[PDB]
RNA sequence: ACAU
DNA sequence: CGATGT
């Protein structure tokens, strides 16, 4: 009902879907990037939801910080409460990085605890993320 | 249908 | 218009 304005909102941003991925996250209350990753040649939008998630659990355990991460994505709050990232895309030479990537964020949610509570943007009463890339 |  | 997902 009420943002939680203590927390960390992430995003994807891509070039086609699948195509060029990249994602960040921003202090929800400020904008200030927190993180942004290095785009990755092929991927899909919901791999790079999925990563943006993970790298922000991260993120945040390594800062021993309890605030919640935001994400407008169903599918990849989904994959991470599942520790698993259940993506369509053919495994073959051009999409090897993506799928290392999300093969090791699987590994690292298999091998630790967190208690961040992962929150799901209501975009339609709230408007974009704030960590959006925008059009 | 809903979320991207 | 297309694609990724539950
Ligand atoms: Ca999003
Ligand atoms: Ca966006
Ligand atoms: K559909």
Known sequence: EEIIWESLSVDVGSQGNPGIVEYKG???KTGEVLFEREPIPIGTN???EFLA??????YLKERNSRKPIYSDSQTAIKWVKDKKAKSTLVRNEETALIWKLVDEAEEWLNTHTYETPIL???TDKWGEIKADYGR
Do not use: E
């Open 53 to 58: 998630i993970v790298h922000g659990l991260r």
């Open 120 to 122: 799901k943007w209501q």
């Open 26 to 28: 921003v202090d929800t």
């Open 46 to 48: 919901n791999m790079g």
